[PDB]
Amino acid sequence: MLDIRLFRNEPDTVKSKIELRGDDPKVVDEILELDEQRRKLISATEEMKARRNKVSEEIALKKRNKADDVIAEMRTLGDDIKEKDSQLNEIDNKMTGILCRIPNLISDDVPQGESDEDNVEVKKWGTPREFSFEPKAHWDIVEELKMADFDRAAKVSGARFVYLTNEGAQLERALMNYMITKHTTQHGYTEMMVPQLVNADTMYGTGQLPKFEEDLFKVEKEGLYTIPTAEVPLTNFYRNEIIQPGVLPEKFTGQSACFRSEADTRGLIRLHQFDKVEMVRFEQPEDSWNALEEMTTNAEAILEELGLPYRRVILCTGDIGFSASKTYDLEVWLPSYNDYKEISSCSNCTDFQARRANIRFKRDKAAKPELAHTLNGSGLAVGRTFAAIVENYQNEDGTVTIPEALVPFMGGKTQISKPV
């Protein structure tokens, strides 16, 4: 949810930032037109309330002095104010309807672009493996090693679901334990487990509603939605609340299953359900930009310790998502793709979700409440890490060497071997 004051005070800047995203800047003129109508309605109600005060004083003065016309005028004024109050509620809801549909205003350093080809590479770590044999794609390895089953999951849930089996399920679990342990013991995040079903206010809070309802699984009877990411319940933990002095920064981490209706046919890259270890931060506004850097680094630490070559990019104006003001994506080397593939999205949402969800804070007991800033980042999407591991750690015999940091999380196992 955008600040109406920016439309009033810097409309050209707002038009520029909307246009840069590939969106229609004319919405700024539509908003200001409604704002002027709203301003006139309020101003006219105030002249009516003042007129009513004069009328009521006259009725009281005539009651003491010893209306019929001042009684009739009082009735008309009462009627007109009631009408103006309903008209104002309507214009407000109309303005809110438009405003909640506008993406977060991009930060100044977001580079201009039209597609993911215009995303700016800011860093590369590690060198893609140079194989002595033809590398197998992760979908073939997981079937050969009986780590995952797609066909049987299609039977029970339809396309783009999977069963993780034996060492496949063990590796998924080991990745989540490793990722959480890293973020909690080394990066100062507090572990959290969240509800996977949330109401519409929560989905609105983080920006998935109203625009992205069709990307979600909806439970119509109870009014719930499956979460597309732990970001949704993690950020909404402080919805409609004033965070207390001395609490910020609040750093949360945790795993959750993630559900996306998805309104990449082979494999783990795009499923309706996947696991992700999420990072969520609540920051003071002057701390959010450093927090984005620290958070992106926290996600890179997983790739680095897992020995997975990657690149960090800044999403261009045409590619950045709805709630972010600035996003870095981490893209992992995927031999089957012969390119880097997105494994994380780290964003600073500024005050966008905080305004939507009414997440405020106070610096001291006397301080005026302020909107917090919120950030979210994948640390990491588990299935895409699992995919990167099996492709990059595959052996010539078709086995998969367990990355060193995951060996103590795999009960001391060092290799994923072929079925007995």
Ligand X SMILES: Nc1ncnc2c1ncn2[C@@H]1O[C@H](COS(=O)(=O)NC(=O)[C@@H](N)CO)[C@@H](O)[C@H]1O
Write the binding mask 113 to 152 for a second copy: x where contact by CB under 8 A, - elsewhere.
------------------------------------x--x
Residue in the shown chain whose Cβ atom is closest to Mg ion: 345
Q: Hey, which residues between 226 and 285 contact a second copy (CB under 8 A)?
A: 226, 233, 236-237, 239-240, 254, 257, 259, 261, 272-273
Residues whose CB falls within 8 Å of the CB of residue 303, separated by 6 or more in sequence, listed in order: 125, 310, 330, 332, 343, 380
Backbone angles phi, psi at 162, to 5 degrees: -150, 150
Binding residues are 229-231, 260-262, 278, 342-345, 376, 378
**Residue 220 site contact among Mg ion, ligand X, a second copy, none (CB < 5 to 8 Å, cut-off depends on kind):** a second copy
CA distances to 95, 223, 383, 410 from 139, in Å:
48, 36, 12, 21
Residue 274 or 310 with smaller CB distance to ligand X: 274
Single residue of 226, 256, 336, 344 touching ligand X by CB under 6 A: 344
C-alpha R_g of the chain: 27
Q: Which is nearer to a second copy, 16 or 177 (CB)?
A: 177
Q: Is 155 in the site for a second copy (CB under 8 A)?
A: yes
CA atoms in the 13 A half-sphere facing the CB of 265: 0
Q: Which is nearer to a second copy, 16 or 199 (CB)?
A: 199
Considering the rule CB under 6 A, would residue 385 count as an interface residue with ligand X? Answer: no
Distance CA 380, CA 179 (A): 7
Which one, of 35, 21, 17, lies nearest residue 98 by Cα?
35
Question: Measuring CA to CA, how many Å separate 289 from each of 217, 293, 295, 313, 376?
Answer: 33, 7, 10, 16, 12
Q: Tell me how far, at minimum, the Cβ of 368 lies from a second copy, in Å.
A: 24
Q: Which residue has 């959010």 as its token pair?
A: 288
Question: Rounded CA gap, 332 and 346, in Å?
Answer: 14
Which of helix, strand or coil describes residue 310? strand
Q: Give the total of residues touching ligand X (CB under 6 A).
A: 19
Residue 264: CB minimum distance to ligand X, A: 8
**Which residues make up each annotated binding site for ATP?**
260-262, 342-345
Minimum Å distance from CB 141 to a second copy?
17
CA distance to 35, 41, 78, 199, per residue, from 82 (Å): 20, 12, 6, 33
Nearer to ligand X by Cβ, of 92 and 191: the residue is 191
Contacted entry of a second copy, ligand X, Mg ion, none for residue 376, CB cut-off 5 to 8 Å set by kind:
ligand X
Residue 344 binding partner per list Mg ion, ligand X, a second copy, none, with a CB distance cut-off of 5 to 8 Å that depends on partner kind: ligand X
**Among 345, 347, 376, 394, contact with Mg ion (rule: CB under 5 A):** 345
Contact, 310 vs 126, CB < 8 A?
Answer: yes
Residue 355 tokens read as: 């305004």
Binding residue positions for L-serine: 229-231, 260, 278, 376, 378
Please answer whether residues 249 and 291 qualify as being in contact, where contact means their C-beta atoms are separated by less than 8 angstroms: yes
Q: Judged by CB under 8 A, does residue 362 bind a second copy?
A: no
342's tokens:
């997105």
* CA 219 to mean position of chain CA atoms: 21
- 166 Ramachandran zone, left/alpha/beta (phi>0; psi -120 to 50): left
**Does 250 engage in binding with ligand X (CB under 6 A)?**
no
Distance of closest approach, residue 81 Cβ to a second copy, in angstroms: 35
Rounded to the nearest 10 degrees, how much is the dihedral formed by the CA atoms of 306, 307, 309, 315? Answer: 30
Tell me how far apart the 2 most distant CA atoms of the chain are, in Å. Answer: 108
271 binds ligand X (CB under 6 A): yes
Residue 368, SS3 per DSSP = coil
Q: Binding a second copy by CB under 8 A: which of 1, 164, 268, 400? A: 164
Q: Tokens for 214, please give them.
A: 């069709």
Report, in Å, the least distance between residue 395 CB and a second copy: 22
Which residue, 163 or 337, is less far from a second copy as judged by CB? 163
Contact 414, 393 (CB under 8 A): no
Q: Would you tell me which residues interact with ligand X (CB under 6 A)?
A: 229, 231, 260, 262, 270-271, 274, 276, 278, 342-345, 376-378, 381, 383-384
Q: Would you tell me which residues interact with a second copy (CB under 8 A)?
A: 149, 152-153, 155-158, 161-170, 172-173, 177, 180-181, 184-185, 190-199, 202, 217-222, 224, 226, 233, 236-237, 239-240, 254, 257, 259, 261, 272-273, 411
Q: Would you tell me which residues interact with Mg ion (CB under 5 A)?
A: 345
